[PDB]
C-alpha cells in the first residue's frame, strides 16, 4: 500500500459556544470525532517513513493559514505591491488541539519506534484513523505545547550533514515558560523560566548533539546570526497579541548558578512580518489588562553553522520561520496511504 495524496478531514472536540477563534473556526471547518480510533496494530510489518516528504504537513499548513486569515485580521496588509485594509477587532486566541482524519478508502499510519528519527524504516508500525490533537502554535526558535519524546531527547534532520537543513529537537521533559505584559509601557513584556531547568535541558540536548556529530566535538550555542526580528527572537502569539522575546540569555552557553529564574525581555509589536506569505501587516494596539501565557517548551528548532574551517567545533543557533517544520514536529510519525 503505497503513499497517496488526497484532501483530509480535520478534527476537533472544540465547543460551539466558545467565542475563541480556534473553537469558532474548528466548529465550522472541522468534525467532532472520533468517536473511536479505535485500535489497529500491524503485526510483523516494517515500513519506511519520511517526515520531510509528507503531504500532510503542507495540507495542515494551509488549514492553519486559513484559520489565521479568518481569525486575526490586520488593519492593513501589504503583499506584492497590493494593499489591503479591513476591520481589525481584537479576538480571543488560544490554540485548541486539532486532529487530521483521512477520507474514505484511505487510512493513516503511525510510527511507534522508540528511537524513531523521522526517516527510514519503522519496525513498530500501527494504523489508525486520525493523528492525536495538535495545537496549531505559531512560533520561532521554541516549540510550544507539543508532544514530548517518550524516552530520551530526540533530534531529527532531513540531512544532519547538511547545515542548511533545520534540526528539530524534541524534548522528553517540558520546561514551563511564563510570559506577561503586566497590568498598566503597554507594549513591554517579559518571560520567566527556571535557569537551572533550562541549563539541564541544554546539557541533555548537547549530549545528544555530541552523540551525532562526534565526541571529540565541542558544542556551542550562539544567538541568531541575524535577519527578521521574528527569527532573531523567540516569537509567538499570546491572547491575540504578538510577542517578540529576546532569547540571547537562552542561547548563550558553553561547557566551561546566578539566579533562580531566567528572565527574557520582550516586546509586543503592532507591525509584523507575516508568516503566511511575504509581506507586512499592522494590527491595532494591545488590549488592556494583564496578558499572560504559560506554555510547555516541548521541542526546539536549530540550524548548524557549516564549516570547517578549523573544525572540531560545532555551532548551533536558534532557527525556525517555516511553520511546516512545526507541523512536521508532530506529524513526523504519520503518513497517508490508499487502500488497494
Amino acid at each position, epitope marked *: 500500500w503505497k503513499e497517496a495524496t488526497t484532501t483530509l478531514f480535520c478534527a476537533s472536540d472544540a465547543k460551539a*459556544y466558545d467565542t475563541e477563534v480556534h473553537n469558532v473556526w474548528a466548529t465550522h471547518a472541522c468534525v467532532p470525532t472520533d468517536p473511536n480510533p479505535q485500535e489497529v496494530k500491524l503485526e510483523n510489518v516494517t515500513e519506511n517513513f519520511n517526515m520531510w516528504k509528507n503531504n500532510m504537513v503542507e495540507q495542515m499548513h494551509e488549514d492553519i493559514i486559513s484559520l489565521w486569515d479568518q481569525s486575526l485580521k490586520p488593519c492593513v496588509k501589504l503583499t506584492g505591491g497590493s494593499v489591503i485594509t479591513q476591520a481589525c477587532p481584537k479576538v480571543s486566541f488560544e490554540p485548541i488541539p486539532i486532529h487530521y*482524519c483521512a477520507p474514505a478508502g484511505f487510512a493513516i499510519l503511525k510510527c511507534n519506534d522508540k528511537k524513531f528519527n523521522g526517516t527510514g524504516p519503522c519496525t513498530n508500525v500501527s494504523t489508525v484513523q486520525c493523528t492525536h490533537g495538535i495545537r496549531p502554535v505559531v512560533s520561532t526558535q521554541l516549540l510550544l505545547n507539543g508532544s514530548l519524546a517518550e524516552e530520551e531527547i530526540v533530534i531529527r534532520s532531513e540531512n544532519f550533514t547538511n547545515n542548511a537543513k533545520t534540526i528539530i529537537v524534541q524534548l522528553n521533559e517540558s520546561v514551563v515558560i511564563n510570559c506577561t505584559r503586566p497590568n498598566n509601557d503597554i507594549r513591554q513584556a517579559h518571560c520567566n523560566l527556571s535557569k537551572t531547568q533550562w541549563e539541564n535541558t541544554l546539557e541533555q540536548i548537547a549530549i545528544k548533539l555530541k552523540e551525532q556529530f562526534g565526541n571529540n566535538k565541542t558544542i556551542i550555542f550562539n544567538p541568531s546570526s541575524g535577519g527578521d526580528p521574528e527569527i532573531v527572537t523567540h516569537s509567538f502569539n499570546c491572547g491575540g497579541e504578538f510577542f517578540y522575546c529576546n532569547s540571547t540569555q537562552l542561547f548563550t552557553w558553553n561547557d566551561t548558578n546566578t539566579g533562580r529564574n531566567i528572565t527574557l525581555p520582550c516586546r509586543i509589536k503592532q507591525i509584523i512580518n507575516m508568516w503566511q506569505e511575504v509581506g507586512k501587516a499592522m494590527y491595532a494596539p494591545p488590549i488592556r489588562g494583564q496578558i499572560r501565557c504559560s506554555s510547555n517548551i516541548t521541542g526546539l528548532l536549530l540550524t548548524r553553522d557549516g564549516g570547517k574551517d578549523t573544525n572540531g567545533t560545532e555551532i548551533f543557533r536558534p532557527g525556525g520561520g517555516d511553520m511546516r517544520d512545526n507541523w512536521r514536529s508532530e506529524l513526523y510519525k504519520y503518513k497517508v496511504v490508499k487502500i488497494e
Partner: antibody
Amino acid sequence: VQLQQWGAGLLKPSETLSLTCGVYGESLSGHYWSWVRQPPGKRLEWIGEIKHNGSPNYHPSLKSRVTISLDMSKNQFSLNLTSVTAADTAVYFCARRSNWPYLPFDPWGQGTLVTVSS
Amino acid sequence: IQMTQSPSFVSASVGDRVTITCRASQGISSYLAWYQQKPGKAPKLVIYAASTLQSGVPSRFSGSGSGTEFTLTISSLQPEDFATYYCQHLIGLRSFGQGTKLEIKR
C-alpha cells in the same frame, strides 16, 4: 436502534425543563447524542450534543442555561434548561449521531411537546 | 451561516419530477444532509454529505452540490414523498434551512 423520550412538557416561566431520552437497541459507547428543538411553525434548531468522554457541546444561544448529560448506568441521556421563558416553547427531539465520522441525525426520538406559559 | 431554500410551499403532482435547492451564506464541503418531515412527527434522514442516500431510501431520491449550492431531487414523486424538506449544515452550528413544504397539485 430506537429512541424513546419522556419528561414534563408543561412548564411555567423561570422553571427548569428536564427531559430524558432512553436508547434501546444500541449502546452509548463510541456514539454522539444530541438534542434538537422545533418552535411552532418554525424550523429545526440544534441544541447540543454529547460524548462518552464527557465533553459537553452546546449551542451559543443556550450556553449559560443548557446542560446535556449521559446517564451511563441506564444508557440514557438528559437535557436540562434553566430559567425557561415562553420562547422555549417547542417540540424537543433527541437523536443519535451516525458516524464515519460523517454525521448526523439518525435515528430520532418521537419528540416531546413542551409548552411554556404561565 | 444561513440556509436559503427555493421559496417552499411548492405544489407538484404525483409522477412529477421535483428539485429543491439549498443555498448557504458561506461555502461548505459536503457537510450537508436533507430531511423529510410530515406534520406531528419527527424528521427522517434522506441524504447526507450532499449526495449520499441514507440506507433504505428509494433510488428516486438523489442529491448533489458543494459550497453554496445544493440540490435535492425526486425523479418521480410518490404520494408518500409529499412532505416538508429541510437542508442542514452538518457542522458548525448545525443550522437548518427554513424548510420546503411539498404539497399535492390539483
